[PDB]
Amino acid sequence: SGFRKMAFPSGKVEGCMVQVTCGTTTLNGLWLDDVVYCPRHVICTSEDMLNPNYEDLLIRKSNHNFLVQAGNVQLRVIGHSMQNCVLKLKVDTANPKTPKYKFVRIQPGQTFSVLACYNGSPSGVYQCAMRPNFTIKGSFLNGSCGSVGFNIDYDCVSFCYMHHMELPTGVHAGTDLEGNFYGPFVDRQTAQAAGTDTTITVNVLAWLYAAVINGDRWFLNRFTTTLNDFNLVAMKYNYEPLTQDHVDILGPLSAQTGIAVLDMCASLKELLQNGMNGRTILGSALLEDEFTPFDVVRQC
Amino acid sequence: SGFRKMAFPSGKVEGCMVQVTCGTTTLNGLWLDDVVYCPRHVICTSEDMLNPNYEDLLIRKSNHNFLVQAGNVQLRVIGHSMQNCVLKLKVDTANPKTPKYKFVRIQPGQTFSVLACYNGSPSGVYQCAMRPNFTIKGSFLNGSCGSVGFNIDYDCVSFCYMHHMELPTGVHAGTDLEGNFYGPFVDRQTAQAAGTDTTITVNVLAWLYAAVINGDRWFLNRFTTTLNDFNLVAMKYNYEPLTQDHVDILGPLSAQTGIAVLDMCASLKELLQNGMNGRTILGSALLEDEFTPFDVVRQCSGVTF
């Protein structure tokens, strides 16, 4: 029993964290096999940042301009290339701690663990979700760029996020490990704003099933709803539309608890209408949306 | 910016997790140097759990009865002894991945990271607090016994908790790494209940400072209070008493934000008597008490390990 916001054990990723320095800029890199992946903005100066021409800045660099430190050992850079917004630094040593890995691009609503690092040193691990507006509500200070988001399945690490920047609202933007940004963001200090954030409906429903599995049924009701009537109500509370894919995904949890997805959708509509009335669900006074249906099945 | 429930990086502890199987029971062990530490209830089965004489059950076990698996390698047990509610299995091989470590007993209100394991394999890491009633609101299923709680200070891992059991309310009970239970609990299948819990006041204040550091000031007010008047209010809302030690501990956060500890106490008093009024603090509608003052400073300063 119990339900916690739980991160994947970070050990497999800790052994990949390195410090990357180019001039006065220092940030984190991910050392996998003989390549160090890091944000390409490590080649920018604080002023260059408004309209950098990364191809122009990169062509002016040599392998020896990149200082890569793995613990107390300096790695030798023997090549460099740019793939979208990530810089790939070929090094002369394969990381002996390289786990079985994959690069996966995730969709909004997906969750992942973040290993927050400063100067190539892991400082903390927390759990995140890719918001529907493609930002992440992380906890990052200056120097955290290059910190990565990941999931572990079996002994395989799926790297899904690399931290690049903080937006004016305090939320974070980054790329997959192929350098493609999540969201309409660019690695430039130009005026950029996150779109209106919405609640991840499928995740809230999954969390309501987790509460039912943990013995909490107070919020249930005798009502059901159509998918269209649910979405009409959900939209008014800034909740993401629930698609038939989401309904299908909740099938296992619906079968396990005996509560049909549209029956749970009706409990959610009523919770949005009434609030919680001094009650909590799984120790929370708000509806939690950073647990996917997969996380719930895995943890419960 | 941002404030998350953040655990210590678990890598140093992952390299210590092993599977311990004795009879029909399989649980987790902590392999440090040439010793595997695990709950002593691994020697128990069905009849045993009811009324267990652990000295009697342990004396009949041979070393070869404890199957210890470290990854895909079986460790050889060359000795066994019991220290309080923890079983120590002497093995022939020192763990080459043994980090710099200490065994520390923590006090209620102190936080730690838990590396939840099943079959000697780490499955998740989460941050939690030792409640004032000595339970932990963890997330544990069957097979999680032997999972450990820890903090990291520089390069030294301080092991502070070993998971032993789940109480009927879904909360968890365990021991320090010397086998002494936190709380009035015993490792036996019997009627046991967690006492009425209280809110960790110093931790709520620390979290209010974290909210101020992150730009949330709506709850601040012009008022201050005496420590005695605050404690009279706090006792009414099942909040732990705030001592002068707590006030001193919050000094750095008070100096950083310009909000005196007793000034933040008057904010807490108004929040307790009036509520949040539809507003949230750091994305929460409840007052969070599982971040210590040190946790807030560490996260808002970026300390690495």
Ligand SMILES: O=C(Nc1cncc2ccccc12)[C@@H]1CNCc2ccc(Cl)cc21
């Ligand atoms: O955002 C950035 N860094 C940070 C990243 N994360 C959390 C921070 C918190 C506090 C200060 C900085 C933080 C850098 C620097 N500031 C502008 C900028 C513009 C574009 C790009 Cl791609 C990177 C950056």
Ligand SMILES: O=C(Nc1cncc2ccccc12)[C@@H]1CNCc2ccc(Cl)cc21
């Ligand atoms: O509590 C225990 N294990 C667990 C531990 N954590 C979370 C669980 C969740 C669900 C089932 C078991 C769980 C064991 C088994 N039940 C009786 C018992 C009595 C005494 C002792 Cl010391 C251990 C135990």
Ligand SMILES: [Cl-]
């Ligand atoms: Cl480093």
